[PDB]
Symmetry: C4
Subunit: 511 residues, 4 copies
């Protein structure tokens, strides 16, 4: 039975799970929800949200508490629980970097600054981030990761785990790079030929080749090479797809490297990370920018022909929920919300002050609607045929171009009937829509707090007819019909409110 | 066992069901609630509202999806469900016209503008309404309707179905008539002698005879003849009563024909429709005019000596509920509310934003009260002896003339006791009353949010005595006594609030 | 086993029930709650209120619907239900007068103005009140009442029924007396010697003897003689205690006789009614005057050495509940609230807009507290040893004189602890207290929303000691101890809130 | 099995219960909740609050109602109930003084001012407080207390009762001392040599030695000697630890002795009470001063090297709950809240208007958190290693000095994440924290509505590492691990909200 795998060719991408494209509808537990005694506050929240994939930390300190003495008992417990609760897993390897720092490395690592040295600032101060240049730290992380991947292969032939995230938001706060002598000797050397080629530059030293950006590009390359070697060695044991996640710099008015985590896969060093990381399948943004223009711009920059869009983390405040459909609209591999458990922790002001059934309901709506047709939606994404949009404040109408024949008007905050006047939008921005092209004249359509009005895009389709507007669900790939919408229910577009409904709409023209 | 039948003589009317007059307390599901997979969101709402009759679409596209290949399986399912849930059915034939358009005609009809042509505007544009002049469209609709009536006769000897509505709001938006050559050849001809007689006019062409109104009267006659031939052929197979429903034009400031649906049974062409439709039992208004003066004027215009009043549709917003009793007061055959299911569709702003137990309670109150004496109420209506009224904003008192001996004062928003000052009315208009004359000195009385004070109408009855004020219910026609109201409960009229109560009041005089 | 009986000597009174004094904690159903089919809306309300005595109409129209054809089946049903629900009964004979009118007399009475004539005004108009002067009406009422009392004796040896109320608010609206010739012949005659004696006047005609008040005194005497003869004949069959109830005239600014019900036992003709009614045990006020000064003045006027105070009716709005204890403080026989059922009738503005568990809770509190010591409370009342008071708006302190040794300060709206400043009173007037003197130094004390502070009334008791402050209840006459209040619970008086608590307080002095 | 015992040496103290230090998390029932018939309104409240120790009055009037006739049946019942409900008991001997007065002494005491004389004012008036100088009153109280201690020893080998409180707030209101001749003869004599030594003064009379404070110091010494002799005699029978409780005088602006209870253990006569009371283990404040500066100053004054801090009573209004942790921070023996039952009594304005699950929740939070590590917390207190603090209005940050190596910053009203700007504090003051030093680099930490940020206190610990931040609970002394907090949960201190959580935090430094 085929194991999970990431494919990408000519800018079309698929996460293949059980032999077909898959879309991650993800939930990530909080950072300290990775022990047997706390899982009873994880699963009741997942039951409410209904993700198809759960992200859980696997901490280096817990799997190798003493060097050479491995303990994967929590991985085993977690696989049983995920199988019982019918979710797939994405495991997060909290090791050399977690939010730039060594806090999840074991005692014998993070207390030993001699064997495992920290970044040194230009002024000579050690700071809370391990240097990518130390061979001992790479060796020890990679050895632990290799034991981890070997264990996974032995106990997960069911393929419950579909991806691995090596490290978590690697990079450095408080310095653009390491300035230790160890670092300076490498920085003074020649830029590796692989990076010279990919960057369209002439050979030379780091300062010669990259100028004012040499410090930041050097640090990104060195972190990338570090994680790539870990990815390559772990894949040699069990070749699950692997991705790294990015602490973002501001898309419009970024600060200086070091204010944001320098060296991480920020939007200015994506080609460096690509060159450095051939064994890393994608670079995934962690988006905690709730403002529409910022969020959607991050989506556009990380969705590249060489980079499948996966939103590995985003906020759990309700205004975030609507960003699922525009993410899927970039035809990547999915979207995950962060902080989904009942441990009473809150990452406000990034996310919600409390996680409960009310705060989860806007997310569960989208997860239920996509799950009603997940495999066809994922087939569409893998062919580049998924369209998605979310409501922007002060803009009550959007236009989606679908193909030569049809377009869709998206209108927010209107009745499900004729109305007089300009569309007002919803009082808060909460609407969204998602449209899959199955064939030129047939679409899968869902939305919430929104009207979707399909209309001709050319003179050939001016004589538009609703042939069928079928409500139903999919069982795997088999369509289960419930009813044909007609009359009032199609006279004013098709109108969605607060319940999950999937429509398979076949259009015709009269002749 | 006698089948349902409509009788009318000298301006008195009855819908005979199971051998006696019947009054429809109706509920209509939304337009796309006509498939097996959605009926579990219909019946729980009917359980709350408690109609005695449910209206459900029977779509041409679903019973003849391919020409000649009939499928009445949903009709069969629906008859079983109506029998289990103890309601009668009125079936709506969604075919050549539904809200003026062909959207419920099958694929092989509504995509074939050659065989089944659309109305052509004066400027040459085909628009979304099938021409009444095409023989193929009439033939195909009638053939489907005949198969439908034949099936009904075979599977409904219980007579669950009591009426059929051929077509739904036939007429045309965007043109006063068809201007195609096919239409013009008929328009240029002589007005049929049947219409010339009924309209008190001299023979001639359509333009000669009817002048400025020729276009609209021609279209109404041609639609009427179309549906009448379908009614006649269907009745030849199974002679259930049949009615058509009207999309109204404004009673006071109507627009132009084509702004409102031209050719439908609007209030200016009722004699045309009568002349054209001898096999159509009545013309029924669909009233979505919530303002008192408009609603009640529509009632008066459609209640004619040659037209039994049936309100086939009205709004499901709570202010509409009170219009049941004035409708029954015209001594027709009943009243039905539109959009009664839990599918989460809303036709706001015509109706309510949500359908739930709260929004249905004002309707259920009236349906429960009338059902407590439905057969005697319907016997009264068939003798012209039913009186009914609803509260008008800014008018806290109304006077009902009952007969030579007695009248009833209706007072809104007062205590059930002595009060000082002018009656204030209810804060919102919600009151109503219904009074049946059983014999000169005995009345059935119910109401809500209202006081009913019977008082002498002549010097012969000045010495008024409450002989009996019996609360109870009817089992069929047998009166079941609960108690005699007296004392406080009759000193200030008889006072109704929010619970269904039927009173049988016998008056006397002391001597 | 002794039957119920009213005793009164030297201004001390007792309703003896089962051989000992009894205090009525009464509830009266609404006027049309006197049929088997409505009793399921009576008993659930009594379960909440918990009266010890229920008042129910027994209508002449229902027990003699045709002359000579008696039907006491409802009396039988009602006795079974009262025994099952553990209440005593007071039966109300709705006959010649109910609120001045004949509406509860049978068909063959109230429609026959010839045999049973109405009062004639000075101008010659018959009005809605039967003349006390017609021998046929007296004969027919008395005959029905005699059949009623005979039936009671046969089917009620349990003595469920403890009193009878002949007629209901007898009197006349719209005329001071009857002016018919039948009436004038009697009015022109001599004042009966019995009334001449009791009124301390010299013999003469009605106009000579009574002057400007002759009309009103004549009507009161004639109604009184009418009901007295009915009482005497009914008592000859079964000598239950009997009382009449009064529709009050204003205590301070009364209107004219005829505006209020002339001839009823109003506060100006109590000596007339005493003289006329030796077989009527007491004259009971019906108090719907919610203002403190009016309510308590009515109490004082009807509590006479020759008249035991029984409040036969009062309002069911919550502000009325507190008037129970000052009524008991006049050492009569009890107090009853009117309109206690769930039939959805309201006599607002006299009483509450709705009867439910919230509106009944302030009454149930008092009924529960008195029931916790009802027989000792009733023994105290029969010895004149009960003291009671209710809160007056704007007066947060009252002083009750108990005996030579002790007094009680009643304070409203204070904490159950030390407080600074003037007592504020409760926000609405809701407090009350009730104190029985068991012996010179021992008292039964209860209250609600109030503090009771016992304190010395003389120099002999200056050295006051709380010997015992026992919370408990009585079983019949046997005291069941729960706890001794001390400390905080007695440092600031004894403080009552919203739960029923009976305290048996023994005082001492240190020496 | 060792019985409870109080140990104190060189300013470190422990209440030894079952052989190890113990911390009282106490609840006291109201003053009249000391009878079998009211205990069903005590235990349901204790179930909600969850104290480990309940204080209950044992009244002299109830155990010796007649002289020589002892009745300890309630003590027996109460021991059974405390064992069933799993709490320890502290019994309060309500005898010669309760809130200065004799109200709980038996009838034959408090009514006999001859045998048991009251304090006489300077003007000759007897007032409500028994004189400490009468030998009969001492003899009779001591005899009753000796019978009580003998009974306890016989029926409590389980050691359910851990301390006894002889008398309750002894002292006098309305006079600084007794001025009777009996008192004056003693006052005129020489100051006992024991008091002369302890007060660092020269021999002489009371007026010579103490001057303006002679009256108050004389009264405190005489009350102290009275209770000490009772303590000594009771301990001779069963040597349970014993304490007296104090009605406080204002810490900053005290009134005159007699306005506050003169002679009680107020903050100016603590050395007198120590000298007079060698058999009294500690002097405990009763703190009903809700203002932060007053409450915490009282704590400081009563926590002395010769006086273990026990807060025997405090308010049950929610603002009081947070004072538990600063009390424990003085390394005494515990803290108890007053008025914890459902009898519907309120000592507002000292405490809450109602006791229910809402008003108890802020207290239950602290009791649950301390109970999760009660024995280690009590071991820490006995070594002087407990630190505790509560939030002060207008101060959102506090600093706790722990040892040479570490300190803790306490921040109130902040998110559990990074925030911009000055800490706002909670809207009402509700935060607190409690920190036990287990060893130099390991701490037990709990709090609520607060952030605790451990940080270096010296250059030696500048390179701080969170080695482990373990959430769990203790079973007795055995630690039960749940999870290791890391990541978000430790990046911004450790953050507590509204649920009980105990963290065992081991700190390291990197090298």
């Amino acid at each position: 039975t085929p194991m999970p795998q990431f494919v990408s060719k000519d800018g079309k991408h698929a996460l293949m799970v059980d032999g077909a494209p898959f879309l991650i509808l993800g939930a990530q537990v909080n950072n300290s929800s990775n022990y047997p005694g706390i899982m009873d506050k994880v699963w009741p929240a997942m039951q409410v949200l209904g993700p198809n994939t759960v992200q859980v930390p696997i901490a280096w300190e817990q799997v190798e508490p003493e060097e050479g003495r491995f303990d994967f008992s929590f991985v085993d417990t977690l696989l049983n629980q995920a199988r019982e609760h019918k979710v797939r897993l994405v495991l997060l390897w909290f090791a050399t970097w977690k939010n730039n720092g060594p806090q999840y490395a074991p005692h014998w690592v993070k207390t030993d600054n001699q064997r495992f040295p920290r970044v040194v600032t230009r002024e000579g101060k050690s700071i809370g981030s391990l240097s990518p240049h130390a061979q001992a730290t790479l060796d020890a992380d990679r050895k632990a990761f290799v034991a981890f991947m070997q264990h996974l292969k032995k106990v997960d032939p069911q393929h419950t785990v579909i991806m691995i995230q090596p490290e978590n938001e690697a990079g450095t706060y408080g310095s653009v790079r390491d300035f230790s002598p160890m670092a300076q000797k490498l920085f003074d050397g020649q830029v590796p030929d692989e990076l010279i080629k990919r960057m369209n530059k002439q050979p030379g030293t780091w300062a010669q080749v990259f100028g004012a950006d040499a410090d930041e590009i050097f640090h990104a390359w060195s972190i990338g090479r570090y994680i790539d070697q870990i990815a390559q060695a772990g894949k040699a044991e069990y070749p699950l797809p692997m991705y790294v996640n990015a602490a973002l710099r501001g898309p419009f008015n970024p600060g200086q490297p070091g204010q944001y985590a320098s060296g991480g896969p920020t939007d200015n060093v994506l080609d460096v990370w690509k060159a450095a990381g051939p064994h890393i399948d994608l670079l995934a943004p962690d988006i905690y920018m709730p403002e529409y223009r910022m969020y959607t711009t991050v989506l556009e920059r990380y969705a590249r022909p060489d980079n499948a869009l996966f939103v590995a983390e985003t906020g759990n405040r309700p205004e975030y929920a609507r960003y699922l459909y525009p993410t899927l609209g970039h035809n990547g591999i999915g979207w995950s919300a962060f902080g989904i458990d009942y441990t009473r922790y809150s990452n406000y002001p990034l996310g919600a002050k409390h996680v409960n059934e009310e705060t989860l309901a806007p997310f569960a709506l989208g997860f239920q609607a996509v799950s009603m047709g997940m495999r066809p939606f994922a087939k569409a994404a893998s062919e580049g045929k998924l369209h998605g949009t979310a409501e922007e404040p002060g803009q009550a109408v959007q236009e989606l171009k679908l193909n030569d024949r049809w377009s869709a008007t998206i209108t927010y905050g209107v009745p499900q009937f004729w109305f007089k006047g300009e569309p007002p939008g919803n009082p808060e921005p909460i609407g969204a829509a998602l449209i899959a092209e199955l064939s030129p004249d047939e679409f899968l359509v869902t939305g919430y707090h929104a009207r979707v009005t399909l209309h001709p895009a050319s003179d050939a389709t001016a004589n538009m007819i609703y042939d069928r507007v079928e409500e139903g669900v999919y069982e795997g790939n088999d369509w289960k019909f419930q009813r044909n919408w007609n009359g009032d229910q199609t006279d004013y577009g098709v109108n969605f409110s607060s319940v999950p409904q999937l429509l398979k709409i076949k259009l015709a023209t009269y002749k």
